[PDB]
Design a protein around this ligand. Structure first.
Ligand SMILES: O=c1ccn([C@@H]2O[C@H](COP(=O)(O)OP(=O)(O)O)[C@@H](O)[C@H]2O)c(=O)[nH]1
Ligand SMILES: O=c1ccn([C@@H]2O[C@H](COP(=O)(O)OP(=O)(O)O)[C@@H](O)[C@H]2O)c(=O)[nH]1
Ligand SMILES: [Mn+2]
Ligand SMILES: [Mn+2]
Lengths: 443, 482
C-alpha cells in the first residue's frame, strides 16, 4: 500500500502516452497530451462561494465508500480522480475507494491503482457498462453512505462534508455537488454557475437552466443553501447506502448507451426522496460529447401517459426494442410511488407540458425566425435570426388553427395582398386568424 | 336635456370636418376622416374572455362620477367616448359625466355636449393640463367613486361593474380595465393581450410586459382574476373618491407635458393601496405618438433610486421642477414605505443595479447586443439583435471590474489576438476577468492589456479579444451608465 503522494505517476502514465503523430483525442474524446502533462494533484482554483470558505465543516459524519467505474479511461485522468478524493477529503470519512474496471484493455490501468492506500479494484469480465458496474461497486461497499464519481473528475476543497451532512441528517436526500467544468481541449478547470438546476425537454436529454429570478431572490439570505433539483446530471452524487438498496439500486437491464440521470431522478422524487445540488460542494468534470433503449426503459416505468409526449418528440424511438421491465414495475407499486403527474406538478412545474397543438417551437424560414419584435396588440410582426431561444420566437399552432404567441394571434387584417399582418387578441371563432400548413400576406 | 340617442351627431360633428386636400392627421395625430365616418354608438367586438360572460359582482354597486378631460379633442372621438359610457353602463351607476374642457380653442366642443343627459361641463379658464383638470373634475364630483377616462375611449360590454366591484369590496384598490387598441389610421377596434402587467425601465418610460411563467401558472384557477400591477397606464382607472382625496389627489404642480401614470402609481403602492388590471373590464383607447413631471415624482418617491433614473436620463439632472415640500409632507403624513420596499414587494421583476455597479443593462454594438447564446461556464459568447426583453442580453460592469451575467463573467482565457473569450464563474481575484470602458465608453478593454472585446468572429466561433483598433467590431456601449 502506498500513500498517494508517493505513488509513481511518471511510471504509471509512463508507457501509455500519445505517440508522435497520433491523435490525442483518439482514445478518449478529450486531449490526452494535455491531461498527461498535469500532475496527479495539480492545484485547482477554489470556485466555492465566499461563504463556504468560512464554514467550519462538521467531520462527525458517516464515512463513505467512493465508487468509480471506468472503461479505457486515460490513465492520467483516472489517477487524478482518485488522488483528488484522497487529497481533498478527511481520511476518516473515506472508508475506501472502489474502482470498477469495466473491461479495460490493460487491466493494469486499474490494478496498478490497487497499490494506493484505500483503493480496491474490481474487474468485470465483459463490458457491463456504467449502471451495472455501479451496482456491483455498491454491493461491495462497506460504508453506510455511497459516493459515485466518473473517472475524470477533480474534487475541490471541502467537497465531501457538505454532501455527507445532508444525507446524515435525512437519508432520503440524494445530493450532488456543483459540477465545475474541466475543458476537454486544454484541461483548464472552470468554475460553474451556482444558479443552475437540472431539467430536460420531452426528448428527455438532460439540460441545465438558470433558476428563475424569483427563486434566486428567495435565496438572497443564504445563497449557499441546498438547491432542490428535478434531475441530477447523474455522474456525481452521494446517497445513503441502504436507501440506494431499498429504492432499487439501478435498473439492472440498462446497458449503455445510457442516461444514468433519467430513471433514478424520477424514482427518487416519485417514491418519496429528494434530489439536491449543494453549492458549497464543488467537483470538476471533464465534459465532452441505440441510446433509446435505456430511455425507453425509464419512460415506460415512470411517466404514465406523459411517456406519449416523449414519443411525440422522438417518434424515432417508438419501436426500438427495450426488453422486460416487469420487475421495475413491481418495484414501483411495492414502494407506492406517486404518479408522474405529481412530479410535473410538484417537482418540475416549469416544464412546459403539451396536451392539442398542431405544432410548437419556432417558425423558421430557415435562417431567420418569426418574431413579435416585442410588439403587442395591433403591432406588426417580423423576423430575426433564430437564437434557439424561446421568448418572442416561440409560437403555437392551435387545435383551432391559430398561430399564437401568449394570447396574441397573427391576424389577416386586410385580405388585399400583400398588406401587413397584425397581432391581435386570440379569438376562438375569428376567421381572419385561421392558418393551415399547406410580415405581410400575398398569394 | 337630451337622450343620447336623440342627440344629433351630424350637427355636432359636421361643424368641424376635414376639408378637401387638408391633412386628416394634422389636428389630432389620428385620422379624423376615419373617426368622423363612425356612428356615435358604433358596434364594437366583444373582446372579453368567455369566462367574463357570467359574471361576478354585487347587486348594490356604488354609482360613479365619470371625469373626462380634453384639449382640442376631435369631436367625433369625444362624442363616442361619452355615448359609450352612457350606452354600455347601467344608467343607475352613472351619476354624472363631468367634461373638463382644458381651454380648447372652441368652447362649443364641450358646451354642445352639455345638452346630453348626465353631462356637465366645466371649462378651464386657461390651459391647466390633464392632472390639474382631473382634480377640478374630481372636486366637483358628487358620487362616491371616481372614474377617469381619456377623451378618445370606447367602453365595451359590462366594462364598469367589474371595476366598481373591486373598489366596493376594498376602497384602497385603484383599478383599471384592460385597454383595447383603437387604430389611429383606420379606427378599427382591436382586442389587447390579457397577459400584460404595467412597468417601466430606469428611464421611467412606461411599458407593458408579459407576466412571468409562474404568474401565468398561478392563474390557471381563474384566468380572469384581477391582475396586480406595479404601474397603471394612467389614462383609465377607477378610484374611491375619498381615497383619491386622502391620498393627495394629484400633485398640483405637475404641468401639461406628463406623464400621469408615474407619481400616482408609486404613491398608491407605497402608501398602502394597490393597483389592479381587471380583465373582464375592456375599454378601447385610440393610441397615437418634458422631464419636470418625472423629476417631481422621482424626487419625492424614489429615495436613492432616483439616481438610476438620472443615470439613464443625464439631461434630467438640469431641469427645474419647482417646490415639492407639500408632497414630502404628504408622504410623511401618510407614513409611506420606502422605494426599496416597492421594488421588493411590488415590482421585483425590475432588475436593479447593485449600488456600486459601474454600468448596467445591455451592451450594445449598433443594433446588436452581447448575448450569452444560452451558454454557461466554459461557453463562448456572441451577439444577437437587441430584443429589450433582458434575459441573455442582461449584463453589469461591477465594482470589481467584471462583465457579468448571473454569476458568470467574461474571461480572457488567452491573451493571444483572436483568442475567444469565455464565460467562467466570477472570482474577484481573477485578473483575467477585469475589463474597463475607454474612449468615452465606446469600447471595452481588458485591464492591463492592449486587447479589446471584438465581434469579428461572433458568428463563426464567438466574441474574441483582438488588438485594440479603430474597427467597428470593437464598439460596445452599456445602455446604462453610472
Ligand atoms: O463503467 C463504465 C464507465 C464508463 N464507460 C464508458 O466510458 C465512456 C464515458 O462514460 P461516463 O458516463 O463514465 O462519462 P460521461 O462522458 O458520461 O461523463 C463511455 O464510452 C462509457 O460507456 C463504460 O463503458 N463503463
Ligand atoms: O386635460 C387635458 C387633456 C389632454 N391634454 C392634451 O391632449 C393631448 C393628448 O393627451 P391625452 O392624455 O388626452 O391622450 P394620450 O396621452 O393618451 O394620447 C396632449 O397634448 C395633452 O396635453 C391637455 O392639455 N389637457
Ligand atoms: Mn463524465
Ligand atoms: Mn389617450
Amino acid at each position: 500500500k502506498v500513500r498517494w503522494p508517493d505513488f509513481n505517476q511518471e511510471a504509471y502514465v509512463g508507457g501509455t502516452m500519445v505517440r508522435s503523430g497520433q491523435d490525442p483525442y483518439a482514445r478518449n474524446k478529450f486531449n490526452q497530451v494535455e491531461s498527461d502533462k498535469l500532475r496527479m494533484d495539480r492545484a485547482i482554483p477554489d470556485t466555492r462561494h465566499d461563504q463556504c470558505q468560512r464554514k467550519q465543516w462538521r467531520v462527525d459524519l458517516p464515512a463513505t465508500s467512493v465508487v468509480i467505474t471506468f472503461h479505457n479511461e486515460a490513465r492520467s485522468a483516472l489517477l487524478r480522480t482518485v488522488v483528488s478524493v484522497l487529497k481533498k477529503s478527511p481520511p476518516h470519512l473515506i472508508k475506501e475507494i472502489i474502482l470498477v474496471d469495466d473491461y479495460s484493455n490493460d487491466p493494469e490501468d486499474g490494478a496498478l491503482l490497487g497499490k494506493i492506500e484505500k483503493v480496491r479494484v474490481l474487474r468485470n469480465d465483459r463490458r457491463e457498462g456504467l449502471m451495472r458496474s455501479r451496482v456491483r461497486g455498491a454491493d461491495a461497499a462497506q460504508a453506510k453512505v455511497l459516493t459515485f464519481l466518473d473517472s475524470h473528475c477533480e474534487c475541490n476543497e471541502h467537497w465531501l462534508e457538505p454532501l455527507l451532512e445532508r444525507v446524515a441528517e435525512d437519508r432520503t436526500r440524494v445530493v450532488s455537488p456543483i459540477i465545475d467544468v474541466i475543458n476537454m481541449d486544454n484541461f483548464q478547470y472552470v468554475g460553474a454557475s451556482a444558479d443552475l438546476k437540472g431539467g430536460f425537454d420531452w426528448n428527455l436529454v438532460f439540460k441545465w437552466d438558470y433558476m428563475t429570478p424569483e427563486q434566486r431572490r428567495s435565496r438572497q439570505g443564504n445563497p449557499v443553501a441546498p438547491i432542490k433539483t428535478p434531475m441530477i446530471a447523474g455522474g456525481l452524487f452521494v446517497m445513503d447506502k441502504f436507501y440506494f438498496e431499498e429504492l432499487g439500486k439501478y435498473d439492472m437491464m440498462m446497458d449503455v448507451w445510457g442516461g444514468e440521470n433519467l430513471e433514478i431522478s424520477f424514482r427518487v422524487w416519485q417514491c418519496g426522496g429528494s434530489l439536491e445540488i449543494i453549492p458549497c460542494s464543488r467537483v470538476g468534470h471533464v465534459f465532452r460529447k441505440v441510446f433509446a433503449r435505456n430511455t425507453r426503459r425509464a419512460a415506460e416505468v415512470w411517466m404514465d401517459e406523459y411517456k406519449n409526449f416523449y414519443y411525440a418528440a422522438v417518434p424515432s424511438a417508438r419501436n426500438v426494442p427495450y426488453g422486460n421491465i416487469q420487475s421495475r414495475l413491481e418495484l414501483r407499486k411495492k414502494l407506492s410511488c406517486k404518479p408522474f403527474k405529481w412530479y410535473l406538478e410538484n417537482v418540475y412545474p416549469e416544464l412546459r407540458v403539451p396536451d392539442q397543438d398542431i405544432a410548437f417551437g419556432a417558425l423558421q424560414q430557415g435562417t431567420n425566425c418569426l418574431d413579435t419584435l416585442g410588439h403587442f396588440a395591433d403591432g406588426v410582426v417580423g423576423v430575426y435570426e433564430c437564437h434557439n431561444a424561446g421568448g418572442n420566437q416561440e409560437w403555437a399552432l392551435t387545435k383551432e388553427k391559430s398561430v399564437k404567441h401568449m394570447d396574441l394571434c397573427l391576424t389577416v387584417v386586410d385580405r388585399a395582398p400583400g398588406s401587413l399582418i397584425k397581432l391581435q387578441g386570440c379569438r376562438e371563432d375569428d376567421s381572419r386568424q385561421k392558418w393551415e400548413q399547406i410580415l405581410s400576406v400575398e398569394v
